Design an enzyme around this catalytic site. Structure first.
Site, PDB file in Angstrom:
ATOM      1  N   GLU B 100       6.018 -13.053  -8.900  1.00 15.30           N
ATOM      2  CA  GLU B 100       7.233 -13.756  -8.433  1.00 15.30           C
ATOM      3  C   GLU B 100       7.116 -15.278  -8.406  1.00 15.30           C
ATOM      4  O   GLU B 100       8.129 -15.959  -8.419  1.00 15.30           O
ATOM      5  CB  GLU B 100       7.682 -13.204  -7.083  1.00 15.30           C
ATOM      6  CG  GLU B 100       8.384 -11.838  -7.240  1.00 15.30           C
ATOM      7  CD  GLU B 100       7.380 -10.733  -7.620  1.00 15.30           C
ATOM      8  OE1 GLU B 100       6.216 -10.910  -7.222  1.00 15.30           O
ATOM      9  OE2 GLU B 100       7.724  -9.722  -8.319  1.00 15.30           O
ATOM     10  N   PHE B 176       3.251   0.952 -11.479  1.00  5.76           N
ATOM     11  CA  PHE B 176       3.240  -0.226 -12.353  1.00  5.76           C
ATOM     12  C   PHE B 176       1.866  -0.841 -12.503  1.00  5.76           C
ATOM     13  O   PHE B 176       1.459  -1.205 -13.626  1.00  5.76           O
ATOM     14  CB  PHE B 176       4.368  -1.253 -11.987  1.00  5.76           C
ATOM     15  CG  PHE B 176       5.705  -0.585 -11.809  1.00  5.76           C
ATOM     16  CD1 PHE B 176       6.180   0.341 -12.792  1.00  5.76           C
ATOM     17  CD2 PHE B 176       6.484  -0.767 -10.597  1.00  5.76           C
ATOM     18  CE1 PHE B 176       7.433   1.062 -12.626  1.00  5.76           C
ATOM     19  CE2 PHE B 176       7.745  -0.067 -10.403  1.00  5.76           C
ATOM     20  CZ  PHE B 176       8.220   0.854 -11.434  1.00  5.76           C
ATOM     21  N   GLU B 181      -0.888  -2.738 -15.660  1.00  2.00           N
ATOM     22  CA  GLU B 181      -1.774  -3.821 -15.186  1.00  2.00           C
ATOM     23  C   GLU B 181      -3.251  -3.522 -15.314  1.00  2.00           C
ATOM     24  O   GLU B 181      -3.910  -4.134 -16.144  1.00  2.00           O
ATOM     25  CB  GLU B 181      -1.389  -4.223 -13.765  1.00  2.00           C
ATOM     26  CG  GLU B 181       0.099  -4.642 -13.786  1.00  2.00           C
ATOM     27  CD  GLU B 181       0.762  -4.883 -12.456  1.00  2.00           C
ATOM     28  OE1 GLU B 181       0.245  -4.551 -11.365  1.00  2.00           O
ATOM     29  OE2 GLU B 181       1.858  -5.452 -12.484  1.00  2.00           O
TER      30      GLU B 181
END
Ligand code: AVU
Ligand code: AVU
Lengths: 252, 252
Positions: B100, B176, B181
């Protein structure tokens, strides 16, 4: 000092991001579109000497820009910028000026007018420790006033208690000068939180020195008052940044 | 009942991009080469003029090649199931970086959008529920964002997980993290540091060295990374205790 690049594009960009996506649940949207806000703001200091400003230049900007503030959530601070913002927590717990539309559009920016085209200096700006007091504080002074005039219910005030040189409350802080005197009767209580920085000598305490000054001034204005020193929620915030400090000890 | 696209997508995107370029994380993350309008073009072409579910893992590739910043050594953080606590501890980039805080994460954070075949090429009224679209389309954007972000991590990486969910293992090949990742971490990563969050006042469900975290360990070691794992370290615990100063765990 080096002015912000592309002042207009940054302004309008923060403006549009704010309008569409920021604090939607917490703060109301303003009536004016972003370009009208831009006109009001630019007019304030453009085509003028960089120290031809007073506490009245940005008044139309703030009138356009002012939001109603949620009750009990407004927070003020002196000398503890960073812990007040962490405690406020981007609007989750309290609201600060930087949460509001104008605070958010101008946070950290640097601008100044000039008499010649294009009305403002994109290269060099005066070290504002050079103009009079009233032109220095013309933007954030009016902002603080416009913000404080909007506060309702209990407001909260976070101060530094570990500064041997700077009193926790000073009549000549932006708070003393512009915020406190602009509280209207919609406000019923000033709640103070004194910060005792970790590892440091304790300098101010509730009920003594400039905090007693403040207490009398608040009570003279027909507000309730209270005061606390390192309340737990706050202490724990400081302990995460320094978790071996003596003040941060937990149970075995 | 229906899912609502972000208004003024293009203005929000350009507004954020510009704001970020000129004023955000300047001391913390480098700027990218492409200007904002170029970034919009690569982002727009990924989905526009197609049916809303006609997207795949490669659609945003050009946008990610253009928007990916180089990321600072030892500062990259990953999380599953603890969004708020991870972002609080990371501290807007001052202690760790999250997706973010990066340019594409910042620009599209919380935004909602989809293509349509007819002009102007994206749908302004309505978007389908993701569960209606095939997985490669539903995950096209955030799937690409996470692989590209993971691929740029260097040094130690930190991974914050939920150790208190009785129905969702702390580590899952299906998250995720596990899809996009862990497996795209390159040979520039030296260590995976796991931080297990035990929510205050809740049953402890996962522990370092057993369960899905023991699977995470052997996985990590068979990629030749070092591994370590800590449960409610003080610096995190003090953040939880700040929002809930009364829990047994925060006792003085
Ligand atoms: C309005 O006033 C107080 C903060 O002002 P004080 O003078 O009480 O606090 P002090 O710590 O003594 O002064 C620091 C000054 O910096 C100004 N400022 C605000 N926002 C910025 C940004 N973004 N960049 C630089 N300086 C900024 C403050 O207003 C202070 O004068 C708050 O409770 C209200 F916001
Ligand atoms: C790359 O992805 C992970 C985070 O996703 P995981 O599937 O590992 O974990 P989970 O918490 O199950 O889901 C996160 C994904 O959904 C988005 N998201 C969740 N919650 C929020 C909130 N509150 N705001 C914005 N977005 C949210 C994210 O976009 C994730 O893709 C991280 O290690 C890396 F980001």
């Amino acid at each position: 000092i080096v002015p912000t690049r592309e002042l207009e594009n940054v302004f309008l960009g923060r403006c549009k991001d704010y309008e569409i996506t920021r604090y939607l649940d917490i703060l109301p949207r303003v009536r004016s579109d972003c370009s009208a806000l831009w006109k009001d703001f630019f007019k304030a200091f453009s085509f003028k000497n960089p120290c031809d400003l007073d506490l009245g230049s940005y008044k139309d900007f703030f009138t356009s820009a002012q939001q109603q503030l949620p009750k009990n959530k407004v927070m003020f601070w002196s000398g503890v910028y960073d812990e007040a913002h962490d405690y406020a927590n981007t609007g989750r717990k309290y609201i600060t000026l930087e949460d509001t539309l104008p605070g958010y559009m101008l946070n950290s920016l640097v601008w100044c007018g000039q008499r010649a085209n294009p009305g403002f200096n994109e290269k060099v700006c005066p070290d504002f420790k050079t103009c009079p007091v009233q032109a220095r504080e013309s933007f954030w002074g009016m902002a603080s006033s416009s913000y404080a005039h909007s506060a309702e219910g209990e407001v909260t005030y976070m101060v530094d208690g570990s500064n041997p040189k700077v009193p926790a409350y000073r009549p000549d802080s932006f708070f003393g000068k512009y915020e406190l005197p602009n509280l209207t009767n919609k406000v019923t209580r000033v709640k103070v939180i004194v910060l005792h920085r970790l590892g440091e000598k304790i300098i101010e305490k509730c009920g003594a020195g400039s905090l007693l000054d403040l207490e009398k001034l608040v009570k003279a204005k027909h507000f309730a008052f209270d005061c606390v020193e390192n309340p737990r929620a706050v202490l724990f915030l400081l302990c995460s940044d320094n978790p071996n400090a003596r003040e941060c000890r937990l149970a075995k």
